[PDB]
Design a binder for this molecule. Structure first.
Ligand code: NA
Length: 129
C-alpha cells in the first residue's frame, strides 16, 4: 500500500507514535517519506547481505527474520514479511523498540540526513489530526 501523507500521519498518531520517546509525529512521517516514499512494500538489499523492509525500512540484521541474513537477530520477534503488510501495526510496534534502544531516531539514516534539524511539523501541516 502507498499511503498518502495525512493518511499515514493519522495511522501513526492513532498507533501511538506522536511524541513517542519525545519524537513528534512529523518526524515519523518525514522518516517514512524518505525511507520508503510511503510504500509499505519497499525493500532494499544492503551490502552486508541484510535487507531493509517496509514503510520505515527496518533491517534484518537486528530486527526481523528473513531466512537469508545469517548470524542475525530478530529483536522484534517477527518475519520480515510482516513489515510489508498494508497493515502498519508490525512496523510501528517494531519502530517503537528501535527508537527506545539507544541512538533514538538516528537509527534511520534518512531521518538523520533529511529530517533531523528541519521543520518536520510541515509533514503533518493541514492534516485532520
Ligand atoms: Na534477522
Amino acid at each position: 500500500k502507498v499511503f498518502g501523507r495525512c493518511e499515514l500521519a493519522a495511522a501513526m498518531k492513532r498507533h501511538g507514535l506522536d511524541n513517542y520517546r519525545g519524537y513528534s509525529l512529523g518526524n515519523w512521517v518525514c522518516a517514512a517519506k524518505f525511507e520508503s516514499n510511503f510504500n509499505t512494500q519497499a525493500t532494499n538489499r544492503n551490502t552486508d547481505g541484510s535487507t531493509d523492509y517496509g514503510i520505515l525500512q527496518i533491517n534484518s540484521r537486528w530486527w526481523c527474520n528473513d531466512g537469508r541474513t545469517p548470524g542475525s537477530r530478530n529483536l522484534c520477534n517477527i518475519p520480515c514479511s510482516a513489515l510489508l503488510s498494508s497493515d502498519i501495526t508490525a512496523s510501528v510496534n517494531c519502530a517503537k523498540k528501535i527508537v527506545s534502544d539507544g541512538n533514538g531516531m538516528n537509527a534511520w539514516v534518512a531521518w538523520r540526513n533529511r529530517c533531523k534539524g528541519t521543520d518536520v511539523q510541515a509533514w503533518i501541516r493541514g492534516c485532520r489530526l
